[PDB]
Design brief:
Chain lengths: 117, 103, 105
């Protein structure tokens, strides 16, 4: 079945950069949009962006434009998010998800990556 | 539910290192509005106290809270009586768990 | 962009009572709204996809709304139903959320 596994560096200094990864298995990696959601500890969800790995279609929110950079490797079933110019506001738990009927919804969840700046 | 309160003195190894942390647990209480007060020698102490409330329990719909009072060994052993007090909605008398460093 | 106003901010419920969580959209989104439940230290869980559709083995007491007015019904609130409930839209790319906190009295 579908499973998503995220690693992240999970520890970083202010002003540096980090690249979180998300490995997908159980489905055709290039048929579902994959989106990232930021959750500060105890707060609510905050949408970051979505990648279509079929042809690499990026679409972000205006708040995470230069911060997050979304990429995807077709050959490895891996979606990466790169966070650069890290500040204290980026310390949160980051999820990589994709739905199962409506591609926009989040149906099946990854384990999350907790980063600390 | 009236909070079950448990106070714990600093452990042996912690006193070897040079600190002393008096821990207090208040479990299985509702509503979440609860105030925790430390009393050193009968006088209220608020410095060195950090509080942490859990989200409502997924099984019995009750709350939990941990209040920790941190002090140096010199400050811990120059006082005797330590009290953890719980003001909650279940009673007008604060729930008191107190211990003396001597015993 | 689309803004999801969710009400109430926090709620206290007796176990075994009906509740409604209101999700209001600033723009019409048809049924492209979806309800999620997030418990303590846990990632959110999809409850009902679309305006009103059942998902796997989610409790059979959810799903309602269309257009700009949506409501999450819960027929019999149980002890495990504590947590934060969110609604999200999949119509516009902003992909916004809301927030409500269901507590149990």
């Amino acid at each position: 079945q579908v499973q998503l596994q995220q690693s992240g560096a999970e520890l970083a200094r202010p002003g540096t950069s980090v690249k979180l990864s998300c490995k997908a298995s159980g489905y055709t990696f290039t048929t579902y949009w994959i989106q990232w959601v930021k959750q500060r500890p105890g707060q609510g969800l905050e949408w970051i962006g979505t990648i279509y790995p079929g042809d690499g279609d990026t679409r972000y929110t205006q708040k995470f434009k230069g911060k997050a950079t979304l990429t995807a490797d077709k050959s490895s079933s891996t979606a990466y998010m790169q966070l650069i110019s890290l500040a204290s506001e980026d310390s949160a738990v980051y999820y990589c998800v994709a739905g199962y009927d409506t591609s926009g919804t989040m149906g099946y969840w990854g384990q999350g990556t907790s980063v600390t700046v | 539910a009236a909070p079950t309160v448990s106070i714990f003195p600093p452990s042996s190894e912690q006193l070897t290192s040079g600190g002393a942390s008096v821990v207090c647990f208040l479990n299985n209480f509702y509503p979440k509005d609860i105030n925790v007060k430390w009393k050193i020698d009968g006088s209220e102490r608020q410095n060195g106290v950090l509080n942490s409330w859990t989200d409502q329990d997924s099984k019995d719909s009750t709350y939990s809270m941990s209040s920790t009072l941190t002090l140096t060994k010199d400050e811990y052993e120059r006082h005797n009586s330590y009290t953890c007090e719980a003001t909650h909605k279940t009673s007008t008398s604060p729930i008191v768990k107190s211990f003396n460093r001597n015993e | 962009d689309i803004v999801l106003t969710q009400s109430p901010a926090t709620l206290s419920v007796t176990p075994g009572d009906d509740v409604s969580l209101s999700c209001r959209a600033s723009q019409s989104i048809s049924n492209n709204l979806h309800w999620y439940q997030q418990k303590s230290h846990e990632s959110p869980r999809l409850l009902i996809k679309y305006a009103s559709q059942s998902i796997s083995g989610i409790p059979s007491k959810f799903g309602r709304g269309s257009g700009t007015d949506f409501t999450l019904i819960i027929n019999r609130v149980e002890t495990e139903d504590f947590g934060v409930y969110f609604c999200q839209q999949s119509d516009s790319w902003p992909y916004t959320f809301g927030g409500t906190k269901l507590e149990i009295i």
